[PDB]
Design a protein around this ligand. Sequence first.
Ligand SMILES: [Zn+2]
Ligand SMILES: [Zn+2]
Ligand SMILES: [Zn+2]
Ligand SMILES: [Zn+2]
Ligand SMILES: [Zn+2]
Ligand SMILES: [Zn+2]
Ligand SMILES: [Zn+2]
Ligand SMILES: [Zn+2]
Ligand SMILES: [Zn+2]
Ligand SMILES: [Zn+2]
Length: 581
Amino acid sequence: HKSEIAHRFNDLGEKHFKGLVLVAFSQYLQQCPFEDHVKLVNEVTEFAKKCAADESAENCDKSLHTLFGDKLCTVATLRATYGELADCCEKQEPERNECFLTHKDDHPNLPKLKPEPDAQCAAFQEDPDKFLGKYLYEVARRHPYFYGPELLFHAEEYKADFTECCPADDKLACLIPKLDALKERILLSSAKERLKCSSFQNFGERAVKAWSVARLSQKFPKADFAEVSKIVTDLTKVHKECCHGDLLECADDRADLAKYICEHQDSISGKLKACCDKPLLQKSHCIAEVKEDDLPSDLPALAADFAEDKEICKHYKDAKDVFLGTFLYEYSRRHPDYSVSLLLRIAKTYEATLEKCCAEADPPACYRTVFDQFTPLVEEPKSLVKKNCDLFEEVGEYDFQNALIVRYTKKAPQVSTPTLVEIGRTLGKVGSRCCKLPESERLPCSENHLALALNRLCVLHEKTPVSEKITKCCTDSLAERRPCFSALELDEGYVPKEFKAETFTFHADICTLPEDEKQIKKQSALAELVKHKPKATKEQLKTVLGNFSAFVAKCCGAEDKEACFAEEGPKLVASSQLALA
Ligand SMILES: [Zn+2]
Ligand SMILES: [Zn+2]
Ligand SMILES: [Zn+2]
Ligand SMILES: [Zn+2]
Ligand SMILES: [Zn+2]
Ligand SMILES: [Zn+2]
Ligand SMILES: [Zn+2]
Ligand SMILES: [Zn+2]
Ligand SMILES: [Zn+2]
Ligand SMILES: [Zn+2]
């Protein structure tokens, strides 16, 4: 064709086109006001309509990156507000776009979105388009790698939540539990896409492919290797584009893939029926979240092709990519009770066993026991999960989170306290989510979600690097990342942080906060306790923190709260140092 922007506008439709352009620009330029981004969207949209009418018109030929990039580079106060991005604007494509992506900010530290039911219902009623658009903008700048089409889907949930609750009597009671739930899905979804983009960035397209082979094989065990390979190839390109900033392209290709999967759902999975009986946005989303299908009764025995066959070395040499891909496909569809990363470690061990064995005198005898090399790899994460769920079920989320904050602060005491607490708390929510599930679903859930949390830590560490041990675990191997982190002990070369009384001094500020914000304050103190006394046991730390909790409960119950904190605080601060030796 002649004009890409015209083609995108026509296939996607104006609503979704404007939505995706608003998202795209909000992510690149995280600090600009909403009303001003709206004007850039409208200008770009006007251009697209003009081109759609005459594709031969001047500039309609230009690439989407060129058109979007030229637009962002016209923004008022560019050099003052976005000093780093103005530099990018001196460059031509595709350099300019690479430069833009370097400077996306994964921790922009904007205000937390606290919902104001009455004021929001008021702004929703007068102008839904403006209100719904504002939601896209606020989430996108807060999550600069968020999946464009996914955010449009979640914008529709947000709209439905307000459509249900704003006519009702009690607005705040209808709405808050729904918004709190939507927010949990925003956090999860955001972390999932970021891991995909992080994998492209730090490990390449092969790693993303392999991850997707394993996962889609688990979900769609009925599908044959050609079908899984096809979907993976397509899905990889979708996410590559969404991660490279090609949001229109990302959306068009996502829709095509959804159509393909739904045309071939008898061949792919019996669970897709519900998903495929829906409009576009909802269809793609249901497929991405779809439950794993039942194991086929005709799954083939694998020992003959992958352990007993005497020409495996020739198969490995003559067709490395396809023989290994077939193995991962076959083993993954067979194991929905394994984590994706476990499956990837198992494939890596398979490859290594063949490398070793095929260079020796008698290869068949050597690789005969290849499947028995997987056994210890399965045991380690199963033990880790049984152990952590036992602890969670005994002590509950708060104490489990604390235990993890201690565990991780010891691994990396150079990391900032807000980061350690964020990560420890996220790691702790894995228990709440995964330990309740059917027992065969715990390992996949647990490890898959730990991967998301560890990627967050790694992403933060790229920006703010403090620890060579974290660097190594985050960059050496995507499959080995969780076991790498687990194997880290107390960093012995860390110099204990100097004591500062104010760090451990509480005040009546704390009493008025909601529960989770009080917890974060206490959990920050705990982190700092570990930094001061890194060799102190988790049992010593739990006791000391308990004594701080008791102190806070008492003085928040006091008639004179300030005097209580002032009399009692310093004694507790002094005594705490002696309890952590
Ligand atoms: Zn055309
Ligand atoms: Zn095209
Ligand atoms: Zn198209
Ligand atoms: Zn659409
Ligand atoms: Zn958010
Ligand atoms: Zn979602
Ligand atoms: Zn691109
Ligand atoms: Zn053979
Ligand atoms: Zn299994
Ligand atoms: Zn305070």
